[PDB]
Amino acid sequence: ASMFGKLREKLKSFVKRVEEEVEKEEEEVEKKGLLDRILTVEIKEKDVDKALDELEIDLLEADVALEVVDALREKIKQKLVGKKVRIGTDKGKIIEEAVKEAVSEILETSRRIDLIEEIRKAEKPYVIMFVGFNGSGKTTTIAKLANWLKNHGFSVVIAASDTFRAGAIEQLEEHAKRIGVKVIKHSYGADPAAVAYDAIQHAKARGIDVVLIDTAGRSETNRNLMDEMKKIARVTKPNLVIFVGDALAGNAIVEQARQFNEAVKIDGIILTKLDADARGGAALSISYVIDAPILFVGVGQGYDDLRPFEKEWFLERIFG
Amino acid sequence: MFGKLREKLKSFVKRVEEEVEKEEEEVEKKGLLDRILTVEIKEKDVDKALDELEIDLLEADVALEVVDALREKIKQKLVGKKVRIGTDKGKIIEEAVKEAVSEILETSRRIDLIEEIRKAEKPYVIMFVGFNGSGKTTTIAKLANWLKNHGFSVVIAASDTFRAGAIEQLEEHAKRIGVKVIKHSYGADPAAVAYDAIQHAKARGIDVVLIDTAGRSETNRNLMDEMKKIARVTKPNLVIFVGDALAGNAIVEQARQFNEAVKIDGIILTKLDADARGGAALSISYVIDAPILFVGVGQGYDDLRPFEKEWFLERIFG
Amino acid sequence: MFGKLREKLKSFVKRVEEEVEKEEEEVELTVEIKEKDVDKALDELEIDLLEADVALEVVDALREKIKQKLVGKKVRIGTDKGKIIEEAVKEAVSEILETSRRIDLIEEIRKAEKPYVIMFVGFNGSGKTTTIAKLANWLKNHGFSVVIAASDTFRAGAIEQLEEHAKRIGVKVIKHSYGADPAAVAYDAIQHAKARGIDVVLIDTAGRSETNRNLMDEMKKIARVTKPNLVIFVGDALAGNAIVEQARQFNEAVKIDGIILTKLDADARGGAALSISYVIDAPILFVGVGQGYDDLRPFEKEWFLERIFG
Amino acid sequence: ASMFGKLREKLKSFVKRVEEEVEKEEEEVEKKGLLDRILTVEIKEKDVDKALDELEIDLLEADVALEVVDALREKIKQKLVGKKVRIGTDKGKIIEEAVKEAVSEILETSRRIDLIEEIRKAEKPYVIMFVGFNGSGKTTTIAKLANWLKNHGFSVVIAASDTFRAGAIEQLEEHAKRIGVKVIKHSYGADPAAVAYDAIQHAKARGIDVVLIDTAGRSETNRNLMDEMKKIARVTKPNLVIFVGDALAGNAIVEQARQFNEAVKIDGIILTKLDADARGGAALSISYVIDAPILFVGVGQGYDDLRPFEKEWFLERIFG
Amino acid sequence: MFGKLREKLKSFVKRVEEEVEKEEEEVELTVEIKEKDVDKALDELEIDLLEADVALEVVDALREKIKQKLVGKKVRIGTDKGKIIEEAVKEAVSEILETSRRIDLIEEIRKAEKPYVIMFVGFNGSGKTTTIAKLANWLKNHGFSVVIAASDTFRAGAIEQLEEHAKRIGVKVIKHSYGADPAAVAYDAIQHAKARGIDVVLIDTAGRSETNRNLMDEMKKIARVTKPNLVIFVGDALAGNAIVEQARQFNEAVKIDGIILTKLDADARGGAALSISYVIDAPILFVGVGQGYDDLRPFEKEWFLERIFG
Amino acid sequence: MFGKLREKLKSFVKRVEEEVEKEEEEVEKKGLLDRILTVEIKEKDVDKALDELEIDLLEADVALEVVDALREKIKQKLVGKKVRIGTDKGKIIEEAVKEAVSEILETSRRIDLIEEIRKAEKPYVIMFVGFNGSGKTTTIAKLANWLKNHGFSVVIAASDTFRAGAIEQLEEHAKRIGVKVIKHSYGADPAAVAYDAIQHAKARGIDVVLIDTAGRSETNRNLMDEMKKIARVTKPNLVIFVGDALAGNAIVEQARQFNEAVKIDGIILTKLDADARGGAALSISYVIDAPILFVGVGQGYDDLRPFEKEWFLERIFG
C-alpha cells in the first residue's frame, strides 16, 4: 500500500505549506492584539500562491497531465481564497477538504457507464472493442471481463483480432477454455476486422449477448495500428470502445489514450496493475483528459482481481 | 492466378443458389407451382451469404471500401430480381456478381496515353511514384521503349539520386533502347534533376519526359514531401503509381499514402501474372479512383502490356 | 564561405549580361531588357539554386523579384550591364532576408516585465547547449541578470557541460533529477527568477524524442507552461540538407520568433542559410562564427550580403 | 507460492509415470502367482525409459539447460534401475527420493563460499566486482549487499562504474545515503575502471573493509560490454566476481552468465525476483552450468529481502 | 542461367587461344603452351570471377588447376586450340565440384537404423520450409515413412504453411506451443518416429536469432539433442552475395553434410553456386528449379557443367 | 591542445615534488644537513602519486596497456634516483616523465616511406583500413599528392564500392592532382577492383597503388572479413590505419579491431591539430606497435604532414 504514494506526498506537502501560512496569519492577529475585535482569519492569495506554484511543479513531476494540474490549481485557489477560518479550529482539515473536493471533481466525466444496464437494453450482440498498446494487459483483461460478464448472466464470445501474436492468442484460448467462453480465430496473420465481423455473425446466429474484440497493440508492416483500429471500428460498429492501459507506465498512459482517442473515440477506460502504482499522477489524470470514465481496475492477478471502479475507493487510496 | 478471389466469389454464388432453391421449395409446399413460374430474390436470400462474402473478401485483401461497394452493388442487383423456377440460378447470380465486379473497376477517367500525349504541348511530363522493390525502375525503361515504338521521342530523369545501383541499371536499359538519361551527382536534388531533364526536352524538342523517383525516405527525410516538391517543380501532366501486385498486404495502402501527397492519375502493377490472390489488384483502381494503365506479366520489354478490363475480368471468373 | 551560392548567382548575372549586350548591339538612346533575355538564365538559376539547398519557395520568390526588377528595365547604352543586373539580383536577395519584424533583443528585455523568458528549440547536434551559454554571457555583458533551466533532462552529459560553462560566467543553472519533467524544471526556474528579480530565463530543451512521446508535443507542453516571451530556433548551418525542414517542424508546434545559426563560418554552400528566415518568417538574431564566447555575433544583413556577392 | 510451479509439475509427472509402471510390475507378479517365491519387484529399464524420454522433453520446455537435463537423467536412471521395491511399500516415495537426490546433487558446485569468512581473512579492502545485464537488479542488489555487509560488522564503499546511467547512479546514491555507505563517482560517461580504482584507493586510505563495484549492463558506443568488463577486472583485480541475474528471465539467465563467464570468471551468483519465479528450470540450472554457487537470492523488495542462499530451502520450494 | 560465369570463362579461353595461335605461328611438329601464354589471361580471369561471386579460395584453386593442366602442355599444330584450352578449363571446373564424399541418400537411409534423422540449417528466406515439404514428398515416393518436427517455433506462419503442405502429402507434423524449445520438439518427434517405426525425421529449424540468443548456439543445442544422421544447409541461389558466407557460419557451429540450393533455375550469375560445395566440402544433394514438388531435383554434376559451358 | 594530458602529467610532477620535500625535511629533523647533500627517491615517494596518475590517465583516454607501461617506466626511472637537497625537483622529475612518454612512442619498426618504396619492386601496394568518417578518403588523396611531389607515379583503387558519394569526391581530388582512379560498377567486389588497379600499375609501370577501402559492414556483411579478403588478394607492402584523433573514446579500439584482422604497419591520425585531450593519440602507436606516419593538421593538401616524434613531445609538454 505504498499505493499513490508520490501523489499523496505532494498533496500532503501542499496542505502543510498553506497550513503554516494560515498559522502565521493567526499569530499576526494574536500578536497585534486584534482578538478583542476578530476571532477568524480570511485565507489570502499570498497564503496560497507560492504553495500553488510548488504544487504545479510537484504534480508535473508526479506525472499529472498539465491540463489536470491547471484545473486542480484553479479549483483549489477558488475554494481557499476568502475562506474564513476561526482561530483554534483544525486548519489542516479545512485545507485538505478543499484539495479533496478538487481532486474528486477532477474524477468527473460527462458520462458514467452502467455496463450491465447498457448491455441489457441493447439489441444483441453488444459489441465491445478494446484498444491499447502491447504490455497494457489487454488480453488478460478481456478474459477477466468475459468472466465478470458471464458471472452476471451474460453469454460471451471473444474475437482474436490480435492476429499476429500467436502467443497471445494461445494464452487467450487457455483462459477462455477455463471459463467456458468461445474464441473465434482465423489463420495466423489474418485480417483483424474479418475475424471480428466473423465473431459478430457467430454471435447473431447463436444468440450470444456480448462480443469482445481482442486487438493488436503494435503496428505490423506498412500500416499504422491507428489505421487498423479505424478499420475494425468501421466494420464492427462497436457499442463500446474500451482503452486498456498499464497503470505502471505513468510516463505514457495518458499519451497512449490520446493517440487512440484521436483515431477511435474512447468511451471507457480500464487500468491494470493499479494495485502496484506507487505514483498515481497518470491514473488521476486519465479520465479528465479523455473525458471518459474508468470502468474497471486491475488490483491483482486473479480473475476476481478485475474490479468495477469506485470513485470513493480511489479517493481513499489517495488521501488515506 | 486470382484463384483465392475466384474461390470466394464462387462460394457466394453457391450460397445464394441454395437460398433461391428453398424459395422454390416453399412455392412447392403451398401447391402453387401450377400458376406461379418465377420467384423474386428477397434480401433474406442474399443476406447471410453477403456477410460471409464480406469475411471472405477481407481475408483475401479486398479493401474495405471495395467490399462495401461490392455488397451494395450486388445486394441491389439481386434483390427484387425474378428468376425462373426450375432453371439453373448459377448463371444468373454469377452474372450480377460479374457486373458488380466490372463496375468496381470503373474509374472516373479513362486514359488514352498516346492520345493524351499527341494533343498535349511538348514535353509531356510523367511522374512515377512508388516504394522501392516495386519494379519502378524497370517499368520506366519498359514504358520508354513502348513510347518509342509508337513514335515518340523520350528522355528520362534520374531523380532516384541516392541509388547509384538503380541509376546504373537505368542507364544500361536506356542505352539499350536509345533513350537519354539526365542525371546529376550522387545525392543531388531530385526536383533539380527532373527540372533539368525538362529544359533539355524543350531545347531538343523531345516528346516525353519520364521522372524516375526515390522509393524510400532519405535521412533528411520525408519521401512524400520530396514527391510534393518534385510535382510542384515539374507540374506533371500525368502521375503514375507503380506497385508490385504480389504485395497484397500493402499495395493499396501504399497508393493511399502517395495519393494523399500527390494525386495519382494512373496505376501500373508489376508481377501481376504471378498473382494467385488478386484482392489487392482488384481493389486498387477503385480506392484511388485511377485506371490501371499497364500490367507487368513477364520479364520481357514487351511484357509491359496495356491494361484491358476485359482480360482482367476473364482472368478472375475463368 | 557561401561559395556555391556565389558561383551560381555570378553565372546567372553573366548569362543575362550576354543577352543584354547582344541587344545593345541590336540597336545601332536606351536598350530594354526583355523576357527573352532572362528566361533561360532564370530556369538554369532555378536548377542551380535547388542544388545549393535553396528552398523552392525561396527559389520562386527570387525568380519573381529578379524578373519584376529586370524585365522592361531600360538602361542607357554604354553602361555596365553586368553591374546593373547584379544590383537587381542583390536587391532580390536582400529582400529575401527581410523578415516581417526585425527584433532588438535588449530593447525587448528592458521594456518587458521581468523575467523575460526565452525558450530554445532544435535537434541535438545543432549547438543549442553551447549557444545558450554564449547567449547568457552576452546578456550579462549588457547588464542583465540571467538564469538557465536545464530542461534537457535526459542528457546528463550536456547538463554537466552547461553547468561548467555557466559557472565560469556567473550564471546559475536550475535542474531536477535525471529524466525530470522538462516543463516542471523550466517553471521552477521561472519562480526562482521572480523570487530573485532576475531579468532573463533561458530554457535549454531536449533535442530528441525519448522512450516516451513526440519532441514536438514536449515543446508545446513547455511553451504552455512557461509562456515564453521569445522562442528561438537553433540550427547547424552545415546541415544544409536538414535545417529548414527542422525549423518548419518546430514552427508548426511552437511559433518561432528568431533563429540562431551555428558553425555559420564553415558554411561553404549557403543556400539553407539564405532560405531559413524567409521560410519561417523570423529574423536571424545571432550567428555562430567560431568557438569563442564572442563568436556568437549579432546578425547583420549587410555582413551576409557581402559574404555572398563580394 | 506458485513458485517453481512448472518445474515441480514436470518432476511430479515423471514420478507418477514410473510409479504406474512399477505398479503394473507388482500386479504382474501378483497375477502370475509368484507371491509364494517373491515379494519384491526390481525396477527395470523398461519401467523408466519412456518416462525419462518425456522428462527430457518437459525439462527442456521448463528452461532447464541441456547439460543439466542430461546429468539429471543419468543420475535418476542410475539410482532407479535395479532398485528393489517390496510390494505394499510406498513406491512414490522411493521414486521421488531418487529424483530429489539427483536434483540436490545438481546443486553442488566445486566451491561453497563463506563471504564473511573470506572477507575477514583477506588483506583489506576485499574487492567485489558485479557483472550482469541491465534489468537484472544489479544496482539495488549492491545496496542491499552493502546493507547486509554493514549489519555484519564490515565497512563498505561503492564504486559507481555504471558511468552512463545517471538515473541508476542517482538511485544508487539515495539507497547508500539511507544506509550510511559512501558512493565514489566521477563525471558522466567517465571511465569505469578509473572510477573503481579510485574507490579502491579511497578504501585503502580510510581503511574500508569492502569495495563493491557497480558495473554497466549494456554496451555503449564502439566497445563490447565484455571488453569493458575485462578492463575493469584487470585494473581492480577483484577478490570475488558476482554474476547478477533476473530469475524471471528464464529464457536468458544461463546464457547471460555464460557470456560473462567467458570474459571474466564468475565466482558466485545472485538471483533477484526469485520469489516470483513460477518456472524454476533456469534457477535450477545456473550453478551447475557456471560451476559457481548461488550466494544470495532476492525474495522481496525490502533490504532484508536479499537472503543468503540455502540449498535445503531451495529443495523445499521445488518439492514442497 | 550462369550467364555471367559462362561469359568470363569464354573470354579467358579466347584470350589464351590467341597467345597459343600466336605461338603456332612462331614455329614455321608440336607447340608448347608457356607460362607467358596464360598469365595475363589468368589474372583477368581472377578479376572477372571475383566480380561473379566466386569465392577467392575457389578462384585460387581454379588458377592452380588451369595452370597445371595447360603450362607445358604440348599440342599438335593444326589442332583447335580453343577447344583444347576449354577442355582443360572444364576439367578444372568439374574437379572444383568434386566433394570429399558423394552421398546416396536412399542408400544411407536403408542401411541405417531407423529413424534416420535429418537436420536442416539456414537463414529465413532461403526456402527451407518449402524445401522440407518437397523432400518429404520425394522420400515418400521412394517408399519411406516420414515425420516433420516443427522446430521453427517462433514462426506461427511458416508452421501453418508447413502443416498444410504436409497434410497434402500424408506426412505428420510434430509441434508444441508457440515459442517452444526447438530441441524439445525435435526430440519429441524422434521419440514418436521410434514408437511408430518411421523411417525419416525431418527437422525444420529457425532461421533467425530471437529476443534470446544466437541462432548458431540454438543449432548446436538441437544437434546435440538429436544427433542428426545428416545435416543439410539450405540456401537461396539468388543470394550470391551471401550464401557461401551463410554456410561457413553454419558449418562452423554444426558440420554440414550436404547442400540444397533453391531458386537455382533463376540464377544468372552462378559464381556462388559454383563455389559453395568446394568451400564447405559438402556435396550439393538437390537443387530447386521451380515451384512444383518434382522441381526439387537430385543434383547432377554433369547437368551443372552443361549449363555452364554449352 | 593535449591540454588534458598535460594537466595530468603536470599534477603528478607536483605530487612527487611534495613527497621529495618531506624527504628533505626529514633529513633536516635528524640534524644531518651538515653531512648529507642528496636524497634518493624511494617508492613510498612515488606510489600514491602513481596511483593518482593511473586514475587521471584512464580518464584522459590513455589505454590501459599504456598506463601500466608508463607507471613502470616512471616508477623505475625515479625510484633510486638521487636528487640534490635544496634544488628544484621539478625539472628532474619532469625529465623522467618526459623520457617515459618518449619510450612509449617507440615502436619496433620505423618506416621511411620514400625509402621503402624506392627499394621495393613496383608497384608498391598500400592498403588503408579504418571506419567511415575518419577522413580516410581525403587522406588518400593527400597522400597521393605528397607521393607525386616526391616523384612517384600513383594510381588509386576505388574499393569503397558501395559509397558513390565518397568515390565521386575521390575522383575530383584525383583529377585535380593528376592521379588515375580505377573503379568498377556500384557494389563491385572490392578485392577485384584493387587487383585490377594492381594489374594496371604493372602494365603502365606505376610506382604506387593506394587502395581506398570500405569503412562499414555492408549487408553481406563483415568489414573485417572484407579487409582480410582484400589483403589476401593484393598482398599489401604496407597497411595503414586511418583514424580521427578527436574520437578519443574509440580510435584505439578501432585500431585493435582492424589489427586483429590485418596487421597494421603504420598509422595516420586526422584532425590532430584540434585534439585538446591527447590520451588516445598518445596511446595508439604503443597499443598497435606501429608508427604514426603522417598527421592531419588542417584542410590543405599540405596539411597532411610527416610525423615527428619530437614535435609531438613538445606539443604535450609545452
Task: Kindly write down the DSSP assignment for every residue of C99-133, as one continuous string.
Answer: -S----HHHHHHTSPSPEEEEEE--TTSSHHHHHH
Both ends of chain E: CA-CA distance in Å?
Answer: 11
Q: Is C148 exposed, middle or buried (0-12, 13-18, 19+ CB in 10 A)?
A: buried
* Cβ–Cβ gap D60/E225 under 8 Å: yes
Q: Which helix (H) or strand (E) holds B129?
A: strand B124-129
Closest Cα in chain B, distance from residue F168 (Å): 8
Closest Cα in chain D, distance from residue F39 (Å): 26
* Cβ–Cβ gap D66/E224 under 8 Å: yes
How many B-C residue pairs are in contact by the CB < 8 A criterion? 30
Listed resolution, Å:
2.2
Computed on alpha carbons and rounded to an integer, the radius of gyration of chain D in Å comes to 24
Distances (CA, A) of D128 to D243, D269, D271: 11, 12, 16
Distances (CA, A) of F177 to A56, C13, D85: 66, 31, 95
* Cβ–Cβ gap E212/D57 under 8 Å: no
Give the Cα separation of A14 and E299 in Å (integer). Answer: 82
D192 cis-preceded (ω within 30 degrees of 0):
no
* Cβ–Cβ gap E191/D57 under 8 Å: yes
State phi, psi for F107 to the nearest 5 degrees.
Answer: -110, 160
The stretches of chain D forming alpha helices (DSSP H) are 5-31, 45-61, 66-80, 91-106, 115-121, 138-151, 166-179, 192-206, 225-236, 253-263, 281-290, 311-319
Amino acid at C117: V
User: Which CATH superfamily includes the segment(s) D4-111?
Assistant: SRP54, nucleotide-binding domain (1.20.120.140)
- Residue D300, annotated as binding a ligand: yes
Chain B residue numbers with beta carbons less than 8 Å from the beta carbon of F187 are: 165
- Residue D132, annotated as binding a ligand: yes
Closest Cα in chain D, distance from residue E251 (Å): 21
CATH of B2-109, one of 3.20.190.10, 3.40.50.11540, 1.20.120.140, 3.40.50.720: 1.20.120.140
Chain C residue numbers with beta carbons less than 8 Å from the beta carbon of B222 are: 245
Please state which architecture CATH assigns to domain E2-101: Up-down Bundle (1.20)
* Cβ–Cβ gap C47/B195 under 8 Å: yes
- 3-class secondary-structure state, position F177: coil
- Residue F203, annotated as binding a ligand: no
Closest Cα in chain A, distance from residue C108 (Å): 26
Give the Cα separation of B89 and A161 in Å (integer). Answer: 36
- C-alpha cell at position F74: 616512471
Q: Where are the domains of chain A?
A: 4-111, 112-308
Chain E residue numbers with beta carbons less than 8 Å from the beta carbon of D54 are: 191
* Cβ–Cβ gap C51/B195 under 8 Å: no
Task: Kindly write down the DSSP assignment for every residue of chain E, as one continuous string.
Answer: --HHHHHHHHHHHHHHHHHHHHHHTT---EEE--HHHHHHHHHHHHHHHHTTT--HHHHHHHHHHHHHHHTT-EEETTS-HHHHHHHHHHHHHHHHT--S----HHHHHHTSPSPEEEEEE--TTSSHHHHHHHHHHHHHHTT--EEEEEE-TT-HHHHHHHHHHHHHTT-EEE--STT--HHHHHHHHHHHHHHHT-SEEEEEE-SS--SSS-HHHHHHHHHHHH--SEEEEEEETT-TTTHHHHHHHHHHHS---EEEEESGGG-SS-HHHHHHHHHHT--EEEEE-SSSGGGEEE--HHHHHHHHH-
- Residue A209, annotated as binding a ligand: no
- C-alpha cell at position A229: 483500429
Give the Cα separation of B71 and B87 in Å (integer). Answer: 25
Residue A65 C-alpha from the chain's centroid: 13
Distances (CA, A) of F183 to B185, E11, F186: 16, 21, 9
- Residue F137, annotated as binding a ligand: yes
Residues of C with CB under 8 A from a CB of A: 176, 180-181, 183-184, 187-188, 191, 212-213, 217, 221, 224-225
Give the Cα separation of A7 and F175 in Å (integer). Answer: 69
Using CB atoms, pick whichever of C157, C177, C179 lies closest to residue D188. Answer: C157
Residues of C with CB under 8 A from a CB of B: 43-44, 46-48, 50-51, 53, 56, 241-242, 245
The answer to whether residues C224 and C236 touch, using CB atoms and an 8 Å cutoff, is no
How many E-F residue pairs are in contact by the CB < 8 A criterion? 30
- C-alpha cell at position B92: 444468373
Give the Cα separation of D161 and A320 in Å (integer). Answer: 41
Chain D residue numbers with beta carbons less than 8 Å from the beta carbon of F52 are: 201
Q: Which helix (H) or strand (E) holds A128?
A: strand A126-131
Q: Which residue of A has its CA nearest to E157?
A: A188
Residues of F with CB under 8 A from a CB of E: 184, 188-189, 191-192, 195-196, 199, 219-220, 222, 225, 229, 232-233
Give the Cα separation of C181 and B263 in Å (integer). Answer: 42
The C-alpha angle with vertex A74 and arms to A71 and A76, in degrees rounded to 5, equals 105
Enter the CATH code of domain C102-298. Answer: 3.40.50.300
Task: Kindly write down the DSSP assignment for every residue of A180-233, as one continuous string.
Answer: T-EEE--STT--HHHHHHHHHHHHHHHT-SEEEEE--SS-BTTB-HHHHHHHHH
The answer to whether residues B51 and B11 touch, using CB atoms and an 8 Å cutoff, is no
Give the Cα separation of B211 and B208 in Å (integer). Answer: 10
- 3-class secondary-structure state, position C212: coil
Mutation choice for F interface testing from E56, E246, E248 by most F CBs within 10 A:
E56
Q: Which residue of C has its CA nearest to D189?
A: C157
* Cβ–Cβ gap A255/C217 under 8 Å: yes
The C-alpha angle with vertex E126 and arms to E120 and E132, in degrees rounded to 5, equals 40
The answer to whether residues A251 and A63 touch, using CB atoms and an 8 Å cutoff, is yes
- C-alpha cell at position B212: 524516375
- 3-class secondary-structure state, position B213: strand
Using CB atoms, pick whichever of A56, A252, A255 lies closest to residue C187. Answer: A56
* Cβ–Cβ gap A194/B58 under 8 Å: yes
Q: Is A292 exposed, middle or buried (0-12, 13-18, 19+ CB in 10 A)?
A: buried
Chain C residue numbers with beta carbons less than 8 Å from the beta carbon of A66 are: 183, 221, 224-225
Per-residue b or e along E42-52, where b marks 16 or more CB atoms closer than 10 Å to that residue's CB: bbbbbbbbbbb
Residues of D with CB under 8 A from a CB of C: 166-167, 170, 187-189
Binding residues of E for Mg(2+): 129, 204
Mutation choice for B interface testing from F137, F162, F185 by most B CBs within 10 A:
F185
How many A-E residue pairs are in contact by the CB < 8 A criterion? 12
- Residue D320, annotated as binding a ligand: no
Give the Cα separation of B180 and B148 in Å (integer). Answer: 12
Please count the other Cβ atoms lying within 10 Å of the Cβ belonging to residue B288. Answer: 22
Distances (CA, A) of B192 to B56, B198, C44, D142: 47, 10, 10, 61
Chains contacting A (3 or more CB pairs within 8 Å): B, C, E
Chains contacting C (3 or more CB pairs within 8 Å): A, B, D
Give the Cα separation of A17 and A12 in Å (integer). Answer: 9
Distances (CA, A) of C182 to C123, C128, C199, F42: 15, 16, 21, 55
* Cβ–Cβ gap E212/D60 under 8 Å: no
Mutation choice for B interface testing from C50, C57, C248, C249 by most B CBs within 10 A:
C50
Question: Touch between chain B and chain F (3+ CB pairs, < 8 Å)?
Answer: yes
- Residue A207, annotated as binding a ligand: no
Q: At the topology level of CATH, where does D112-308 sit?
A: Rossmann fold (3.40.50)
The conformation of residue D123, written as its DSSP 8-state character, comes to P
Q: Give the class (CATH, top level) of B110-306.
A: alpha beta
- C-alpha cell at position E15: 584470350
Chains contacting F (3 or more CB pairs within 8 Å): B, D, E
Please count the other Cβ atoms lying within 10 Å of the Cβ belonging to residue B210. Answer: 25
Chain F residue numbers with beta carbons less than 8 Å from the beta carbon of B165 are: 186-187
The answer to whether residues D172 and D183 touch, using CB atoms and an 8 Å cutoff, is yes
- C-alpha cell at position B94: 454469377
* Cβ–Cβ gap C221/A66 under 8 Å: yes
Mutation choice for A interface testing from B59, B65, B258 by most A CBs within 10 A:
B59
The answer to whether residues E264 and E288 touch, using CB atoms and an 8 Å cutoff, is yes
What method did the depositors use to determine the structure?
X-ray
The answer to whether residues B216 and B177 touch, using CB atoms and an 8 Å cutoff, is no
The C-alpha angle with vertex A153 and arms to A152 and A155, in degrees rounded to 5, equals 115
B123 cis-preceded (ω within 30 degrees of 0):
yes
* Cβ–Cβ gap D223/F51 under 8 Å: no
The C-alpha angle with vertex E294 and arms to E292 and E296, in degrees rounded to 5, equals 90
* Cβ–Cβ gap A61/C176 under 8 Å: yes
Q: Which residue of A has its CA nearest to C183?
A: A60
